[PDB]
Amino acid sequence: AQLQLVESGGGLVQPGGSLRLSCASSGFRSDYYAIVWFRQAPGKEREGVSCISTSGKTTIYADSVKGRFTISRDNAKNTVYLQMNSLKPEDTAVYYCAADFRGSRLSDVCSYSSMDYWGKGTLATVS
Amino acid sequence: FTLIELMIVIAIVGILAAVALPAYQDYTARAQVSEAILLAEGQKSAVTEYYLNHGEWPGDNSSAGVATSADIKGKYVQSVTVANGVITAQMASSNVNNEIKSKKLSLWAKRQNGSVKWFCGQPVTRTTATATDVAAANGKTDDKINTKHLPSTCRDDSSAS
Ligand SMILES: *[C@@H]1O[C@H](C)[C@@H](NC(C)=O)[C@H](O)[C@H]1NC(C)=O
Ligand SMILES: *OP(=O)(O)OC[C@H](O)CO
């Protein structure tokens, strides 16, 4: 039941701009995993940014990113999109997408916890 | 007797042959729904263990400890999911009774001061893992098992406590 997560869309952007990160999951039951976007910056530990549940109707965002980041899921394309608006210089980091096996497609709960699979990560920096 | 009597008995034989049948489909649906009741009851131990050891209802099959929802399947049951400590069993869409095709039943528990009361019946939804109340799942489609196809001991309402 191995799952492969590929992150794309990262790159340079100006302050106050808009960015989109796509995490594509390929596997047996990719539509059974809650998708969590973490970020890691040089000089600080990994922290979660935004988690989307398997059902997709429950989304949680970090306090520093609440109101600016929006997470959405497309099971037909098997990809989770994270849209960042009004990016700040403190957001210069590498973003990883991770899959947590929820055991249910209709799961309404997701949180930053022991993730089964991790993505390579994309460098998203603003200057 | 005469020819009229023979014709009358032939008509009576035809009546008996073409006699209407009772709602045996409802009883067969109850028998098949018993399998989903058993499958849902199987996950009760895991759900209760998680609730007791963590103080909140299991959000889904993952931390409930039970298998994947699509993997908990029987002859007439296609899925058994866990949602905020509520075990919902959905029957198959084919090779089952027409009255319970792709229909769902529920098993939910309310924590009392002395015990944990388990209720079985129509689908219910718990909004939060820490919530102590349940409500009817949704209108949507005909995903609700009719009370005709549930045992009289498995027709508990959402408001029941
Ligand atoms: C098990 O379900 C719990 C409801 C959930 N808690 C919250 C607050 O969502 C917990 O994260 C789950 N545990 C694991 C390991 O997935
Ligand atoms: O949520 P669950 O694991 O029951 O899966 C729903 C899907 O319709 C097939 O099981």
Residue numbers in the entry:
A (entry chain B): 2 to 128
B (entry chain A): 1 to 161
Direct quotes from the study:
Typically, the type IV pili are helical polymers constituted of one protein component, the major pilin. Type IV pili not only serve as multifunctional organelles allowing the adherence to host cells and the auto-aggregation of these bacteria, but also play an essential role in their pathogeneses. Molecular dynamics of the whole pilus with GATDH and G3P for a period of 1µs showed the overall stability of the structure. As previously described, the PilE monomer contains a 4 strand beta-sheet region, and an N-terminal melted alpha helix that forms the core of the type-IV pilus. Immune evasion against antibodies targeting type IV pili is thus attributed to the structural diversity present among strains, including variations in pilin sequence, sugar type, and phosphoform.
To address the impact of the presence of DATDH on antibody binding, a strain expressing the pglB1 gene rather than pglB2, and thus displaying a DATDH modification, was generated and the structure of pili determined from this strain. C24 interaction with pili was not affected by the presence of DATDH rather than GATDH as shown using an ELISA assay, or by immunofluorescence staining. The structure of C24 complexed with the pilus expressing the DATDH moiety was determined revealing that binding of C24 to DATDH was also stabilized by R103 in the nanobody. Although the C24 nanobody is in tight interaction with the sugar moiety it can bind to both GATDH or DATDH with the same efficiency.
